[PDB]
Amino acid sequence: TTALVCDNGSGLVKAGFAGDDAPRAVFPSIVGRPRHQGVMVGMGQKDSYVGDEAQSKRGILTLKYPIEHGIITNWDDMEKIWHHTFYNELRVAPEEHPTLLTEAPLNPKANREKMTQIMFETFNVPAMYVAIQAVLSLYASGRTTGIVLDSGDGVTHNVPIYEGYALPHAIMRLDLAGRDLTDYLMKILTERGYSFVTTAEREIVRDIKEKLCYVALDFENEMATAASSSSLEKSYELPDGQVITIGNERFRCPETLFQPSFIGMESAGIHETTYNSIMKCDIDIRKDLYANNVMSGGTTMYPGIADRMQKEITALAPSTMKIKIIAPPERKYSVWIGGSILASLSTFQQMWITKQEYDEAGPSIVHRKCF
Amino acid sequence: TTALVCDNGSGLVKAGFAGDDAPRAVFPSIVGRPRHQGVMVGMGQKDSYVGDEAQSKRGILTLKYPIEHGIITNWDDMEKIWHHTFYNELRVAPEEHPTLLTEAPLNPKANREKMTQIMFETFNVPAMYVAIQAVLSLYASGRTTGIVLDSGDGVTHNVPIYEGYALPHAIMRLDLAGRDLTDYLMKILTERGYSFVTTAEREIVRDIKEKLCYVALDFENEMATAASSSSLEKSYELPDGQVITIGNERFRCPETLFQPSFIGMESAGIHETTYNSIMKCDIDIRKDLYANNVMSGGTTMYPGIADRMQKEITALAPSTMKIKIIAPPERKYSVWIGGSILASLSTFQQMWITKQEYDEAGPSIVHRKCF
Amino acid sequence: TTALVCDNGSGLVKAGFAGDDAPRAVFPSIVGRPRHQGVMVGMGQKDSYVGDEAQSKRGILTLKYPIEHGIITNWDDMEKIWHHTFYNELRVAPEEHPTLLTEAPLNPKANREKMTQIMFETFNVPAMYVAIQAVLSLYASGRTTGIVLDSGDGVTHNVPIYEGYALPHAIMRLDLAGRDLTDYLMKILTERGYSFVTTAEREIVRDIKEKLCYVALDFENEMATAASSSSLEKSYELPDGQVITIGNERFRCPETLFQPSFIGMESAGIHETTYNSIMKCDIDIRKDLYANNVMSGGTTMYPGIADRMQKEITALAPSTMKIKIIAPPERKYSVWIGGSILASLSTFQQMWITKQEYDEAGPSIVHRKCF
Ligand SMILES: Nc1ncnc2c1ncn2[C@@H]1O[C@H](COP(=O)(O)OP(=O)(O)O)[C@@H](O)[C@H]1O
Ligand SMILES: Nc1ncnc2c1ncn2[C@@H]1O[C@H](COP(=O)(O)OP(=O)(O)O)[C@@H](O)[C@H]1O
Ligand SMILES: Nc1ncnc2c1ncn2[C@@H]1O[C@H](COP(=O)(O)OP(=O)(O)O)[C@@H](O)[C@H]1O
Ligand SMILES: [Mg+2]
Ligand SMILES: [Mg+2]
Ligand SMILES: [Mg+2]
């Protein structure tokens, strides 16, 4: 049989079949419900919308994310999204395909316990497995050694791995990702008179961020350049025809990744977090870690972020060390690619958690059989 | 057939074929096991590593020496190391080659009894012999008269030999060698803020000791010079790019050989030990012993140690006696060279302990046929 | 004149006058600076806060420890804390009172050199002395023989003393103490969905650890009991009214003292460390050392830790030896009590380092006149 790989991210859902190069279904992980009363009978009206249908009708819906900071908060909507993924997007029967799921490190245990329970009861999957997202990214990188910086919509985390061995004590996790940057961009757009308060407007600001934001090599010099002339100004057309122009907000929004104090957080930036994760490892592997910095996720797709990370790590690392940032063009799907590679391995087939084992042991078996 | 010579030291393993000038396989006598859990499947993961493979992966392994103070303490790891030496390093079948083994004097009898049993049962060697390390050094020196000071990683011992006759009552043994100096250097490096606590860091400190330590002709004058200026300061680059600077610790570490009280030991120094060994011999051979002081082993490779030993022995010996310290440049392999010379001798071929004799007599035959 | 005793620990500062039974000033060794911008003028706003004032306003401050692992890392904040201790807490003039300072063994020399320089220049103290913390604990125990296990917030160390004589070669030091346990508890609280990332939240987790953690006599049996029922579960009320419940984390956090591998460290536990320290001493004093195990410091205040240590040492020691763990109820201030006792001794008054001697010799005199 063919195995299923499902990367349930905070923002997007990636699904497909093991052995493929790219996921087949990529749709937003949103559930939308009407906030206005219907007046016209005879047309199909649903109580909820999932995914692209929710995005298309977002003008009359309230959009709610069931996953927040890599933690599932609404299990009803999560089950709806899983049903949608299994039936309307993949056109498969979950009872005939083992499914591989992903999760961020340092997550609550009940999250994966309930994921296993839902998989084994609601959908009757013959076997399932929960992997750590950064490990899959390293699988997709074709490497057994390196520190992975995976930053998506909810969670930014660091996992150092050397010769296939992970160092759990050096694992870093920070709840600062694309959604926080979108909210900060919404906050800072009010300085030019642009107001976005609803969820659909949040989806518009997210699109603006995806299409106009970039990371500046030097923040203060970029600010001076923006305050000096209008070369950095760009225009964006709203869906109603309105045109907005933004200046320094293009690079101020992703600067929060390196200066978390912009949103009131006391934590250090991603570069200092990676440096601290490297320094917590054994001294004999830091040289290999310095040259194998792997970035994955949507939040790593900002233009010029790899150069900024390389500059900061070089400024933090000793001069004799060689710093190399690895940013493949397809890093937005590295987790799914690595999951498919893992599920397509012959040696992995003995690591599946089957229905009989779950019945014998209960939901607690996921802690034993999964890292 | 060709005979095998194996010098199983506390720190290093020297192996080769009788008749050669240098051993062919020289690798550390360490067994390393992972102390972290693997996360990446599909790659070759072994439960243990032996030798250079353990040194290369020491960042994720715990390193254990199976031989401590010239005494085998872990026979499982010792058998693993012997298997590695026989198969992966020499590429020979032990059933077709007589092997010559080495041992420090005044060792427990069970050590060589179990060595003989392992050789005759696990590897089915046709014949084996156990020699005293210091005698072999005298063989490699091309001498039949002299007192040998052999100091390796575990044991420092003195064996006076005159005209091919040894004096067992004058044999000295002291459990103070390179490993103790490495531990003392680790202890004293904390005075400059440098912390090394793990086994891999111990291997780093051992390398630092090998590359930066030297013996001072006058300890107090050297201390005053070090406290006066920075001429004695030198820098070392850690594997992660960090740079450390050490001053008086360069000559304080090997000073423990002459002042054992630095590590809390009540025994006398190597010079006084050699003088006492000489004085316990007959008065008519002391003149020949004074001029034939032979040094062998890695711990005798410190710069300026021969001059210090000569000065101390001259200060202890009568003025009319002539003191000459013999420190060949290749004394790190003198034991192996002498073992090969002994195994290449025609008259020695009748001294082998064969399988039939061991079967008739048992492990106790090594006490009768070996000194 | 009256002598001052100041135990500058990693976590807390203990100060008072020689001859007293308890220190008069006990406040946290923290310096806090605002991380938000002020908006209301006319009120007293300070650039930094020290001690209890920093604890009270920790919601708008970033808290930094100037002492890390018994080593002073921020001398500006350390000088601020010393000024606070001298003036706002003790209400004394440092120029009129000799001060006694404490330090952990195997510390960098520059630490105490700079401590002496600051005492003799910034505060113009007429005389000062630096003692080893564990020796003072033995003074407070009313003993001249015994091995002291002192574990505070930064350093856990062992010092064996027999008949007033210390054995430096058997002194153990391990950088695993209450702060590491607090960080591990912060890491493991994420399994139940509780997130603490800021310094103030670290102070909250430290309080939770102090009020709810205990050492289990049998770790595996305790884990089975916790996984079987809810008898071990307890509740804690957060300062904002939130209530959290923890189960096995109560005894998993202090288990790191006996299993350092939980935080990725390769070192052995405190029981094995004490056993190795005892075994490195002379065979004729081990019997007296076995019956005089003295514990001091905040990290020794966990319920049931003395019984666990006694069980482990009995399992390691020979059956005919008698193991007695000495855990006085006031061991959180044993270092300060012993310092006051030492400073109140007539024979000690000739061991003070005076201003004239420091001027003649410089900062290097502390190495000669202090152990
Ligand atoms: N080109 C881009 N530039 C900046 N941010 C992007 C880009 N593409 C996607 N993102 C952001 O990355 C996040 C989604 O990436 P993804 O790795 O799919 O997250 P998740 O795994 O949580 O679904 C969103 O916050 C999105 O706004
Ligand atoms: N150049 C050197 N200077 C100082 N010590 C050395 C040097 N080379 C080797 N050593 C020490 O000698 C010991 C190993 O020497 P060796 O004679 O091979 O010992 P063994 O026979 O016990 O293996 C190690 O402790 C090593 O640190
Ligand atoms: N009742 C308790 N249980 C567990 N840990 C405690 C308790 N009381 C204090 N501690 C811990 O001990 C440390 C402080 O003790 P102390 O001996 O004063 O350390 P220091 O000398 O480094 O200031 C802190 O980590 C604190 O959390
Ligand atoms: Mg993701
Ligand atoms: Mg040797
Ligand atoms: Mg203390």
Numbering used by the authors:
A (entry chain B), B (entry chain C), C (entry chain A): 5 to 375
Paper text:
ATP-hydrolysis-coupled actin polymerization is a fundamental mechanism of cellular force generation. Actin polymerization powers fundamental cellular processes, including cell migration, organelle dynamics and endocytosis. After incorporation into F-actin, subunits rapidly hydrolyse bound ATP in seconds. F-actin polymerization is coupled to the G-to-F transition, a substantial flattening of the actin subunit that renders its nucleotide cleft active site competent for hydrolysis.
